[PDB]
Design a protein around this ligand. Structure first.
Ligand code: TTP
Ligand code: MG
Ligand code: MG
Length: 539
DNA sequence: GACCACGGCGCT
DNA sequence: AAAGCGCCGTGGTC
């Protein structure tokens, strides 16, 4: 029930391929095949074979499409059963799993993969039968978006290598001064990178009171938060906090990034994973460029390393208070929609409160602090943690939480409805109908249940913002190609583009408009836009 | 070398 | 009682 034919596969066939490694940009195409009707075609010389295809249909189409772009081809990605599955159940994140759940085994033979892609698409496509809403998301968002992600990955972003190279030597020296002090304070050297060794030193050798425990092993935590609480109990704590910062940045960004520069491009190429999140957001792997530093001074110094090619400019666009505007539209809370209809900003307002300064005195750093608070409280943070963090009394934190929700009466009602329906149906959905199954909504253990609920009511808000960003990327991409501009990165509610200096303004202008008008809501969407030679200056 | 579980921590 | 991610050392394998 599956014969073999000479390479030349008929049009519309599903491809199957094997890579030396999972990164499309660094991978060696080991094998390539195709499956159609009831037979399979294997290419004797894979690279040569790529030229024959007109489209990539099958598991991980975008990835082969990326490698294709890397070789000068324009093979756009088409149907991909992974996208259908992801839409049926966001827990379908890997081929291994999707193949086992929907009909087969993910092997290492290209032929078998092409055959697998075909039968999988057939079964999954049959399951979406009637799911008009998921069908809309597939054809109007996911499938086209895959093409967008391909170009983004293949294009990559420029990095100032010698800059980070020198930054490394500089920080290494500061790390040395910090570890050296810590050791003097402890009275003896030990591996500071080891949480276990630091536990003993802090809680046994020194007489510092433990503040909390780790989740799976119950050890006394040495988290930055636990360290905050002990900042004044001993001189060694501040030191460890700075060591933690520097080494985190150094080992995670400063040193690894310069070594990931592809030779044929001289740019960094990240993976944009389309089926890896339970809410519908994307993620970046290998170089995960969705978590590049930005808070601290050294963090900012690192972001300054992402630069535009000579003669071009980076254009950074970011939705304003994105998830709050979504909540207003989902909850229907008129007081909250009025906030936006009146051009207000909850982050600036919370910041004003936090630091005891008039709005107009809040800086971007203070406002950034307030966002974690606003979203922390919205999504479930406890009075206890809130009081701890802000460093205020329990009652003062308990009051803020009360006022917050009392101020937007409809939000809690919406939350409550999202859960009831979630309990009955077994899943929750976004504005466009993206679904996430949350069975634990009925666990008989409060601990597990309430955690399940927090995950449950957050999905529609985070997911909807995701649908929006993806939709916008799909509408924006073609407009950019015609203007000679390129899309480089996506950071959940942010886009980083690269445009020739003579068009950077028109591009910024166009992107902003495209994004703000993506899908009109009961509240306007505002996009902040910036232009500059490096990512930091862009925003 | 190649992986994994964890505690941590960078970003949204 | 914030949610969603991926990556880095440490320990401990294999
Ligand atoms: C920063 C942050 C954001 N989010 C979500 C909600 C929002 C979305 C995007 O993040 P941000 O862009 O940082 O926040 P924002 O869109 O609310 O506002 P702006 O950029 O204008 O400052 O991610 C959280 O759930 N937790 C967080 O800590
Ligand atoms: Mg934003
Ligand atoms: Mg953002």
């Amino acid at each position: 029930a599956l014969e073999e034919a000479p390479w030349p596969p008929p049009e519309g066939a599903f491809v199957g391929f094997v890579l030396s490694r999972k990164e499309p940009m660094w991978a060696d195409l080991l094998a390539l095949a195709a499956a159609r009707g009831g037979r399979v075609h294997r290419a004797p010389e894979p690279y040569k074979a790529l030229r024959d295809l007109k489209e990539a249909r099958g598991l991980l189409a975008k990835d082969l499409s990326v490698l294709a772009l890397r070789e000068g081809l324009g093979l756009p990605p088409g149907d991909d059963p992974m996208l259908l599955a992801y839409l049926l159940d966001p827990s379908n994140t890997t081929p291994e799993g999707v193949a086992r759940r929907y009909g087969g085994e993910w092997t290492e033979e290209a032929g078998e993969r092409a055959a697998l892609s075909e039968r999988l698409f057939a079964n999954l496509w049959g399951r979406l039968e009637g799911e008009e809403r998921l069908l809309w998301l597939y054809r109007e968002v996911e499938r086209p978006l895959s093409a967008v992600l391909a170009h983004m990955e293949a294009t990559g972003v420029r990095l100032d290598v010698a800059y980070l190279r020198a930054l490394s030597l500089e920080v290494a020296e500061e790390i040395a001064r910090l570890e050296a002090e810590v050791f003097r304070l402890a009275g003896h050297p030990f591996n500071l990178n080891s949480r276990d060794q630091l536990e003993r030193v802090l809680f046994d050798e020194l007489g510092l009171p433990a503040i909390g425990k780790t989740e799976k092993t119950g050890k006394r935590s040495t988290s930055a938060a636990v360290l905050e609480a002990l900042r004044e109990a001993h001189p060694i704590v501040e030191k460890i906090l700075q060591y933690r910062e520097l080494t985190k940045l150094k080992s995670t960004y400063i040193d690894p990034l310069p070594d990931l520069i592809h030779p044929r491009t001289g740019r960094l190429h990240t993976r944009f994973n389309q089926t890896a999140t339970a809410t519908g957001r994307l993620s970046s792997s290998d170089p995960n460029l969705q978590n590049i530093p930005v808070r601290t001074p050294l963090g900012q110094r690192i972001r300054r390393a992402f630069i535009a090619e000579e003669g071009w400019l980076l254009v950074a666009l970011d939705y304003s208070q994105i998830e709050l505007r979504v909540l207003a539209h989902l909850s229907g809370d008129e007081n909250l929609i009025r906030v936006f209809q009146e051009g207000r900003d909850i982050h600036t307002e919370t910041a004003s409160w936090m630091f005891g300064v008039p709005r107009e005195a809040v800086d971007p750093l203070m406002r950034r602090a307030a966002k974690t608070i606003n979203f922390g409280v919205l999504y479930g943070m406890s009075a206890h943690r809130l009081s701890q963090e802000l460093a205020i009394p329990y009652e003062e934190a308990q009051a803020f939480i009360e006022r917050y929700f009392q101020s937007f009466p409809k939000v809690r009602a919406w939350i409550e409805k999202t859960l009831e329906e979630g309990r009955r149906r077994g899943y929750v959905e976004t504005l466009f109908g993206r679904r996430r199954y949350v069975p634990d909504l009925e666990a008989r253990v409060k601990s597990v249940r309430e955690a399940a609920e927090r995950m449950a009511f957050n999905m529609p808000v985070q997911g909807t913002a995701a649908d929006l960003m993806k939709l916008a990327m799909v509408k924006l991409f073609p407009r950019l190609e015609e203007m000679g501009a390129r899309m480089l990165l996506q950071v959940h509610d942010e886009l980083v583009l690269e445009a020739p200096k003579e068009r950077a303004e028109a591009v910024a202008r166009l992107a902003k408009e495209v994004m703000e008008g993506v899908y009109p809501l009961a509240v306007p969407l505002e996009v902040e836009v910036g232009i500059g030679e490096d990512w930091l200056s862009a925003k």
